Amino acid sequence: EHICGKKAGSLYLSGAPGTGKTACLSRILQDLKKELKGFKTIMLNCMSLRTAQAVFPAIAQEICQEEVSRPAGKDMMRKLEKHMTAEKGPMIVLVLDEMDQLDSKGQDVLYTLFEWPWLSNSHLVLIGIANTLDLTDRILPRLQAREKCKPQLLNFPPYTRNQIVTILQDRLNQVSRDQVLDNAAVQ
Amino acid sequence: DRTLQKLKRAKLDQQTLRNLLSKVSPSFSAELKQLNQQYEKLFHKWMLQLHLGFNIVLYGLGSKRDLLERFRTTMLQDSIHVVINGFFPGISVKSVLNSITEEVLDHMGTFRSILDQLDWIVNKFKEDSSLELFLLIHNLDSQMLRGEKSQQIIGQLSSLHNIYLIASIDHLNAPLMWDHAKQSLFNWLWYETTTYSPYTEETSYENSSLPLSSLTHVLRSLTPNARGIFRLLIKYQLDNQDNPSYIGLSFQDFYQQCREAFLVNSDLTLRAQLTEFRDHKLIRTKKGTDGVEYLLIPVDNGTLTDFLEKEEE
Amino acid sequence: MATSSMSKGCFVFKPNSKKRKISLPIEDYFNKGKNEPEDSKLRFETYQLIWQQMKSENERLQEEL
8 A cells, every 4th residue: 555555654563572473574575576676675684783873874875776875974864864755766665673772862863763754755664573572662752642653553462272283284294295293292 | 539440531642632622712712813913013123132132031821832933934034043942852952052063054063072062163153243043942941951051051152142042931930040140141031921822732741641552462462371470460469459568479479379370380481471571661570688579560550450341351 | 833743853944045145234123114214223323322332431430440
């Protein structure tokens, strides 16, 4: 609905603490490349960033694929949000990960990435892959206070025996010739 | 007369209640409009005093920020004017002084301490006699500038007649933020303002209660064995709440109650089930003198009473 | 409004879009209506004459005493 209806907003995915859902989002991203051709998706891997800063310039080198530039020192919050508001460019999709680890003493770095798809020219979809540690209490104080932002929340319940036993039937019976254990040990 | 259990008007809304607040009461609305136009007759009166090194003080009733927004669209189109509306928990002295460096003076930010930037901007407006700057600061008395180090920075800029300061006062302790050593630079000129209009902007820092969606979406993505433990400690909390000496249940009786209600099996596995509760600000441990880690829930007394009614399905 | 629905307070309005650069004096606003426009500018230029001369007397009287 966002790529066809020309819409853009935020989407906070609060996954279960440690369940291995990183491969679920990778399946959807690769299916959109073979369906539609014209858009570009920039990845994010802030595992080597021990500080709260040096995050925006790390993804500033990907402007429009073939058109790149170079940093000049102290130039954020000016050129990154300028190219996003351009209606002549394609719909850029930004992926977010471990957003809880990017906090600060006043989480000021998280006040600019959640207000871009809500001001003029909303052409950015927010996708945050992170487990459940804390909801909207101190990270995003705009909720339960401001009536401008309307985020969406989706949770994932823990898989009981209805899914763990099911995920093993299509795992061993499709690649092995004969099972090595009985059905009583699976339960 | 007690907590929040006698009245059914619990859980105050934040965004789902502004739909019914737009229908205001038109009680003598004609007399309130002409009161605002009474101050509009003195349009060409502010520039006759601000150019001599004076300021404008705004006090009284009504929304002080909803009045200056109309004066800017009538005579502030060709003059260097900067409006400051610092009310959200994040406004400081660094977001205002460093904002006139790469925009007004065109210079990148590279200062060191606080005193290094104060004496650097004075030389730019003292040697040049053609750098006017109007400061339309809204609600100067916020909540994060009560210290004496905040007025001494802006007080130095008031000594020059080329800098115009326009602030609003919404507190009965107006002379509590400045003494005689600072009034010589500002030279406050009091002007009463009567608007009679509520505030629908800065209402966010005040304490509402906690969102009920957080306690509901935390149990859906939780293991089935952990939900029975959370629903067991809430029963023993309200039954012993009448005791004023409630210090919390111990760990020995808590470990015995688990197997009595078919829960955990060992001790190290029980401690692993309390990892997602201490990180979600649900329970915490205290350094007890008896060597026993107490278990309490730092929430409101009326919040736990409304949790047993939503789990009936 | 457009200067309060976000998490920043850096909003400036520099007169740069206009090509011409004009200066508006102070005495041009003393006559807001029918209040002798030819005499409004004559009494304002004397307002600073009687004020800059009394300040020179204050600094002289305070110094001679």
